[PDB]
Each structure stands twice: as C-alpha cells, then as structure tokens.
Amino acid sequence: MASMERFLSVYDEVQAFLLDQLQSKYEIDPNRARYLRIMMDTTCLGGKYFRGMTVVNVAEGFLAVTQHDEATKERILHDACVGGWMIEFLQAHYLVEDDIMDGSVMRRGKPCWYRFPGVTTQCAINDGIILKSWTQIMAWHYFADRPFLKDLLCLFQKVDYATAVGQMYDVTSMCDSNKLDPEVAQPMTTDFAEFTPAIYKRIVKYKTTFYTYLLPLVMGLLVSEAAASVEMNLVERVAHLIGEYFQVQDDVMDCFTPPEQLGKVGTDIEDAKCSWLAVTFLGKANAAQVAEFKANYGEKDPAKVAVVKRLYSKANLQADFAAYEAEVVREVESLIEQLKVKSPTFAESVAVVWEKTHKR
Amino acid sequence: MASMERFLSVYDEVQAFLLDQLQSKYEIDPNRARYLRIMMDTTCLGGKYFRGMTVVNVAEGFLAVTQHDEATKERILHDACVGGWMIEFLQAHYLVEDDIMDGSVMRRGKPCWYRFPGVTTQCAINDGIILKSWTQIMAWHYFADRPFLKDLLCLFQKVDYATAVGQMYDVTSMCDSNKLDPEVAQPMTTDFAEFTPAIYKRIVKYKTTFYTYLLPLVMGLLVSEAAASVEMNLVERVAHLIGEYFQVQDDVMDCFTPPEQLGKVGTDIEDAKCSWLAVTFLGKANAAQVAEFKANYGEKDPAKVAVVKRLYSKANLQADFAAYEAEVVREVESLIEQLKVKSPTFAESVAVVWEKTHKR
Numbered sequence: 001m002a003s004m005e006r007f008l009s010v011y012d013e014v015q016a017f018l019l020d021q022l023q024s025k026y027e028i029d030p031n032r033a034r035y036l037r038i039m040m041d042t043t044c045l046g047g048k049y050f051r052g053m054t055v056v057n058v059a060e061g062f063l064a065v066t067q068h069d070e071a072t073k074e075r076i077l078h079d080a081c082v083g084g085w086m087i088e089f090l091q092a093h094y095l096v097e098d099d100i101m102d103g104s105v106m107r108r109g110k111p112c113w114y115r116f117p118g119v120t121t122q123c124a125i126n127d128g129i130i131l132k133s134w135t136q137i138m139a140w141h142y143f144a145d146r147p148f149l150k151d152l153l154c155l156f157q158k159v160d161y162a163t164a165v166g167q168m169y170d171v172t173s174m175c176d177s178n179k180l181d182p183e184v185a186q187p188m189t190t191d192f193a194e195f196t197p198a199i200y201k202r203i204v205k206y207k208t209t210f211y212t213y214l215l216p217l218v219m220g221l222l223v224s225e226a227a228a229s230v231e232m233n234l235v236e237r238v239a240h241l242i243g244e245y246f247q248v249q250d251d252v253m254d255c256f257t258p259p260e261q262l263g264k265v266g267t268d269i270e271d272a273k274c275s276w277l278a279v280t281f282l283g284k285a286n287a288a289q290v291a292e293f294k295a296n297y298g299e300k301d302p303a304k305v306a307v308v309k310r311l312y313s314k315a316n317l318q319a320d321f322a323a324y325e326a327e328v329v330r331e332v333e334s335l336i337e338q339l340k341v342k343s344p345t346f347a348e349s350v351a352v353v354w355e356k357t358h359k360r
Numbered sequence: 361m362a363s364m365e366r367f368l369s370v371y372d373e374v375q376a377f378l379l380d381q382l383q384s385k386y387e388i389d390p391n392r393a394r395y396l397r398i399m400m401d402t403t404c405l406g407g408k409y410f411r412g413m414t415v416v417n418v419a420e421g422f423l424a425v426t427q428h429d430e431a432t433k434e435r436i437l438h439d440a441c442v443g444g445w446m447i448e449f450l451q452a453h454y455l456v457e458d459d460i461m462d463g464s465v466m467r468r469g470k471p472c473w474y475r476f477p478g479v480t481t482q483c484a485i486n487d488g489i490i491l492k493s494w495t496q497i498m499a500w501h502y503f504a505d506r507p508f509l510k511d512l513l514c515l516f517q518k519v520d521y522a523t524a525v526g527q528m529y530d531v532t533s534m535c536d537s538n539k540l541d542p543e544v545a546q547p548m549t550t551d552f553a554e555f556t557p558a559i560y561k562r563i564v565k566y567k568t569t570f571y572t573y574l575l576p577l578v579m580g581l582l583v584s585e586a587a588a589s590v591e592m593n594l595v596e597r598v599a600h601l602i603g604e605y606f607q608v609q610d611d612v613m614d615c616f617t618p619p620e621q622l623g624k625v626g627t628d629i630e631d632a633k634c635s636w637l638a639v640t641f642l643g644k645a646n647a648a649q650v651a652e653f654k655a656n657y658g659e660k661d662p663a664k665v666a667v668v669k670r671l672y673s674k675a676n677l678q679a680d681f682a683a684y685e686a687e688v689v690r691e692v693e694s695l696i697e698q699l700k701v702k703s704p705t706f707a708e709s710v711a712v713v714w715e716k717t718h719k720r
C-alpha cells in the first residue's frame with residue numbers, strides 16, 4: 001500500500017472510532033456527531049500532512065532493515081499512521097485556537113473555523129479543546145498494550161507544553177519584557193531592542209519546531225522501537241535547525257507570497273511580529289532606515305505597511321536569506337552525517353524531511 | 361498538619377517547581393515567569409478548593425484504617441495534594457476558556473482573566489491551554505514512579521474529554537438539534553422541545569459532574585491504592601447524582617442570588633440556557649405561561665428578563681426544588697448505604713462531600 005493511501009484510510013478509521021465512541025459512551029445524538037465530523041474534517045484535512053507522514057516515513061525506513069512478521073509490519077505501519085494523526089490533530093488544535101487568538105480571517109483559502117456561520121468563537125474554542133482531547137483518546141485506545149505508550153504520551157505532553165510556551169513567546173514578542181504585567185495594557189515596543197536573532201530563535205524553537213519536526217521524528221522512532229538507533233541529542237539539534245528554517249520561510253512568505261498562493265492575507269507587519277524579516281532588517285539597517293521602520297511598523301494603515309515592505313526590498317534581504325540558507329544546508333548536512341554513525345536509515349529519513357522542507 | 365495548610369503549601373511547592381522548570385528547560389525570562397505566576401494565582405486561587413480537598417479527604421479516610429510507615433503516610437498525603445491541584449488547575453483551565461467563550465464579565469468578584477488589561481483574549485486562550493498543560497507536567501513529575509500513574513492519567517483524560525463534550529452540550533442547548541450545522545448561523549429554539557429533564561441531565565452530567573465529583577473521588581482512591589475497596593459503578597452513580605444537584609443549585613443561584621453574593625451578574629435567562637428553572641417551569645406551566653416564556657426568554661432586554669423571573673416565582677419552583685432535594689437526599693443516602701458494604705471509610709468521605717454540597 002502506498003503510504004498516503006494508508007494514512008488517509010486510517011483517518012477514516014480513527015474518525016469512525018471517535019464518533020462511534022461518542023454515541024456509545026457519551027450519549028451524543030446524530031446531529032452533534034455530524035457537527036463534530038464536519039469540524040474534524042474541516043480542521044484536520046486539506047494540508048500536505050508532512051508532520052503525520054514523517055512518522056510513517058521514519059517507520060517505513062526501519063521496516064526495510066529490520067526483520068518482522070508481516071502482521072508486525074502492518075501493526076507498526078498502523079501505529080505510525082495513528083501517531084501521525086495525533087500530530088495532525090494537535091496541529092489542528094493549535095491552528096483553531098491561534099486563528100481565534102489572532103483574529104485571523106482565512107486559512108488554506110477558506111474561512112477560519114471560528115468564522116463559519118454555525119460555529120462562532122463560543123463553540124470554536126471548545127472545538128479546539130476537543131481536537132487535542134482526541135489525540136489522547138487515540139493514544140489510549142490504539143496503543144493500550146504497547147510498550148512505547150508511556151514514552152509516547154510523555155513526549156507528546158512535553159511537545160504540547162513547549163508549543164503553548166512558544167505561543168506565549170510569539171504573541172508577546174512585540175512588547176518590552178520589563179513591561180509585561182497582567183494589570184497593564186501592553187504597549188508595542190518603541191526600541192525594538194528585543195528583535196534579535198537569539199530572541200527570534202527562542203520564539204521559533206518553542207512555537208513551531210517541537211511539534212513540526214521533533215515530534216514526528218521521535219514518534220517514528222518510538223513506534224518502531226528504534227530510539228536506541230539514534231543519539232537523541234542529534235535528533236533534537238537537527239529538528240531545531242530544520243524547524244527554524246521552515247519558520248524563516250513562513251515569515252518571508254507572509255510578507256511576499258501573493259494571498260491567492262499563501263491561502264491568506266499575511267498581516268505580520270501590522271501585527272508587529274518578531275519576524276525573520278524584521279530582525280534581519282534591523283541587523284543591517286542604518287540609523288535613518290531604523291527610524292523609518294519604527295515610524296511605520298505594527299500599524300494597520302496600508303501606506304505604512306507598503307513602506308515597511310519597500311524597506312525590506314531595498315535592504316536586499318534576499319541576500320541575507322541566501323546566506324542563512326547556505327549555512328543551514330551546511331549544518332543540516334553535518335548533522336545528517338553525525339546521524340549516519342548509528343543509523344543510516346534514520347539519517348536518510350532526516351534527509352527526506354530536509355528535502356521536503358528546503359524544496360517547498 | 362491540618363489538611364488545608366498542607367494543601368496550600370503544596371500549591372507553593374508546585375508553583376515553584378513549574379516556574380523553575382520554565383527557567384531551566386524552557387528558556388523563560390523573569391518577566392514572563394512573573395506573568396505566569398500571577399496568571400496561576402489569579403486563575404487557580406480564591407475558591408473553596410472542594411474539588412482538590414476531596415482528594416485529600418478521601419486519602420485521609422483511608423490512612424486512618426490502613427497500616428503504613430510515617431513516610432508512606434506523608435507521601436500519600438503529598439500525592440493527594442498534588443492530585444487535588446491537578447483538578448483545581450483543570451477547573452481553572454475550564455473557567456478561563458468558558459469565560460472567554462461566553463463573554464463573561466466577572467468571576468469571584470473580580471474581572472474574568474481575559475478582561476485584565478495586560479491579558480486580552482489573545483493571551484488568555486493560550487493561558488488556559490497552559491493551565492491544562494501544567495496538570496500533565498505535575499502528574500509526570502510527581503507520580504513518575506507511582507503504580508497508579510497510568511490509571512490516574514487515563515482517568516484524567518477521560519474526565520477532561522467528558523467535560524469538553526459537556527461544554528458542547530451546554531453552549532448548544534438552546535439550538536434545535538436537527539438545525540445544527542457549521543455552515544448556518546444557529547437560531548434559538550422557538551418550541552423549547554429539547555428543554556427536558558433527560559436532556560438537562562445529559563448536559564449537566566458531562567459538563568460538571570465528571571470533573572467536580574467523579575474525578576476527586578476516584579483520584580482519592582487511586583493515590584490510596586484503594587480502588588478495590590469500592591464498587592466503581594456505585595461511585596459513578598453517586599458522583600452523577602450529587603453533581604446534578606450541585607448544578608441545579610448553581611442554576612437557581614444564577615437567577616436568584618444577589619450579584620454581590622454570587623460574585624457575578626447571572627445571565628442564564630439572557631443566554632437562553634437550558635437551566636433547571638426553565639426545564640422545571642416548562643414541566644408545569646399552562647399554555648399561556650409557556651407562550652409568555654417563549655416571547656421573553658433568551659433576550660437581553662431587562663424587562664423580558666424580569667418577566668421570566670416573575671414567571672419562575674409565580675410558578676412556585678421553590679416547591680419543585682424541595683421535592684427534587686428530597687428525592688436526591690433519599691437516593692444519596694441509599695448509595696452511601698450501598699458503599700458501606702465494601703468500605704465504611706469511603707462511604708463516610710461521600711457523606712462529607714454530600715454535606716459540603718447540600719449545605720453550601
């Protein structure tokens with residue numbers, strides 16, 4: 001079976017399980033089951049599934065070099081798919097709640113979930129809650145007897161928590177730290193002294209890289225019982241490196257990729273986000289360029305946004321991006337080499353992850 | 361040590377643990393640690409702690425009849441307190457997100473968390489997320505080596521999930537089921553045919569009773585290694601019965617307890633909630649009374665709200681409440697008797713829970 005066909009079929013299985021359980025144990029009625037089915041589909045489907053399919057791809061790499069009965073190969077692939085869906089549902093949770101938090105308009109060429117007419121924020125917050133609850137239901141049901149259940153749940157929790165910490169770092173990135181205070185409405189920074197590479201790296205590390213790269217990789221290992229074919233410190237280093245890059249790309253596309261192509265109108269400039277573009281601009285700007293950035297950043301006025309975009313283009317950030325990209329390629333190749341020492345197989349999956357990221 | 365002194369001290373311990381971990385492992389800075397400390401205090405403290413102290417009280421009952429080294433007694437009490445805080449933080453999660461979902465104004469005589477000037481919804485949704493993530497961090501850290509870790513995590517998950525299902529039943533209780541549809545803005549029901557005792561019971565069972573009564577009771581058992589001193593089906597029956605009652609009280613106070621005393625301006629009438637008062641009114645009203653209810657319920661206009669309140673008073677619902685209360689007392693006494701067969705101790709804790717509920 002091709003991997004994607006298998007992955008999508010398990011989605012239907014998992015869906016039917018969750019909805020059937022709601023009828024047999026939770027007293028749901030058909031109409032609310034239908035609401036949840038449509039919520040699930042709308043929030044979990046339609047992306048490229050690279051998080052969830054990474055779990056599958058890691059597990060397939062190990063299958064090709066490990067002796068197993070056919071039943072065991074099927075069981076391992078089924079587990080990789082369920083694990084993959086846990087990650088996809090965890091992302092769906094994030095995206096639902098983030099969209100509400102940020103007052104987002106579109107996601108993937110469609111309205112954000114909370115903006116559907118029959119949803120509203122009042123339901124959507126709870127819908128996002130359920131999305132994450134379903135990850136746990138999956139794990140407890142499908143992995144009940146599995147030796148990796150404990151490690152998998154613990155890993156999941158830590159990644160989840162890192163992710164929520166990262167959302168806090170992200171939504172607070174345009175405040176001055178010493179001014180954070182729940183009793184006082186938070187002004188945007190005037191100095192941008194916290195728009196640094198180290199601070200940007202901290203935001204992106206927690207908000208994206210743990211769930212997008214570390215979790216799929218380590219889940220692949222756990223469902224394969226292969227965590228001893230790797231030096232976990234290298235797996236973390238390479239996840240954080242590739243994850244940072246992925247985010248830098250995301251940050252550039254927010255500003256420069258056409259809305260029709262991005263699936264949304266990017267608003268990082270208006271939201272005063274600590275983006276790669278802002279940090280890199282401030283790292284090379286002269287005093288006049290910095291003053292014009294401060295007078296125009298974080299404003300809804302389209303004229304000021306166009307002025308920030310012009311400031312980025314004139315500063316030739318595409319060159320800083322190339323240099324960044326070169327250094328990442330260098331370091332990713334290095335870590336892949338270090339990973340070959342203990343597992344060629346896992347190194348190869350990491351190469352594939354890098355290819356999918358670098359060439360998207 | 362008195363139970364409450366112990367419980368509150370463990371709060372300080374757990375707080376310091378969580379904040380210290382954020383500095384050592386999550387790269388937090390002092391100011392964001394301070395934000396989280398104040399969030400924690402504001403959202404987790406200030407109630408009566410009957411959920412969390414139930415865990416302690418169950419565990420203390422078992423200590424009085426089970427032989428143990430002094431170190432083991434301290435360890436069991438410490439675990440009961442940590443478990444109790446897991447439940448309190450889980451409630452804090454619910455309350456933060458529910459307040460945002462419902463556009464609530466006050467909670468416990470103070471602004472809802474999201475309404476603090478330096479919070480906003482954008483942070484508060486995530487703050488609520490973290491609150492629940494901290495429950496898991498507690499469990500994995502404090503119960504790492506414990507034999508009950510698995511059962512406790514599994515129990516927690518199921519209760520959490522039941523709770524989120526119950527929030528969906530609650531916020532959808534004024535829609536007609538057959539009209540639920542994420543593509544279509546949801547009209548309030550005109551017939552109120554779904555305002556029935558069985559439907560009300562389903563809402564309250566999931567939204568309140570699993571986390572408020574079932575979880576504290578069963579956690580008390582688990583940290584005591586005493587789950588075989590009870591018939592779990594009786595524990596569930598008695599939790600659901602007492603929990604229903606607790607909610608009925610809550611529903612009556614929303615309408616009739618002065619705002620200064622309730623700690624908020626109750627809005628169940630305006631929100632068209634499926635409350636005990638509405639269901640009981642519709643169960644006894646004549647055709648004219650039902651028509652006047654339909655023309656005035658679920659409206660912000662204070663005149664219509666005063667008309668619904670008058671309709672409840674004239675219908676002598678305090679009498680239906682007494683009869684309900686009598687039947688609950690009867691059934692609770694019966695279940696306590698059935699629980700004595702296997703554990704006098706646990707039966708007594710359940711009597712105390714009932715006393716605290718019935719006499720609040």
Ligand SMILES: COc1ccc(-c2cc[nH]n2)c(O)c1
Nearest residue numbers: 050051054213216353356357
């Ligand atoms: C774990 O590896 C990956 C690899 C690539 C991507 C990707 C490419 C376009 N969107 N997402 C990902 O989310 C995870």
Ligand SMILES: COc1ccc(-c2cc[nH]n2)c(O)c1
Nearest residue numbers: 252256312313316317318321
């Ligand atoms: C002015 O800033 C930029 C920076 C980077 C890029 C980029 C990177 C890969 N493709 N395009 C860009 O289009 C504009």
Ligand SMILES: COc1ccc(-c2cc[nH]n2)c(O)c1
Nearest residue numbers: 410411414573576713716717
């Ligand atoms: C598990 O037992 C209880 C007993 C009583 C209460 C109560 C009384 C006033 N608020 N809450 C509770 O939340 C849980």
Ligand SMILES: COc1ccc(-c2cc[nH]n2)c(O)c1
Nearest residue numbers: 612616672673676677678681
């Ligand atoms: C008109 O409806 C009611 C129903 C019940 C009560 C009640 C129950 C315990 N104390 N008070 C009430 O004050 C008004």
Ligand SMILES: [Zn+2]
Nearest residue numbers: 098101102170
């Ligand atoms: Zn966001």
Ligand SMILES: [Zn+2]
Nearest residue numbers: 250251254268
């Ligand atoms: Zn972005």
Ligand SMILES: [Zn+2]
Nearest residue numbers: 458461462530
């Ligand atoms: Zn609510």
Ligand SMILES: [Zn+2]
Nearest residue numbers: 610611614628
């Ligand atoms: Zn209420």
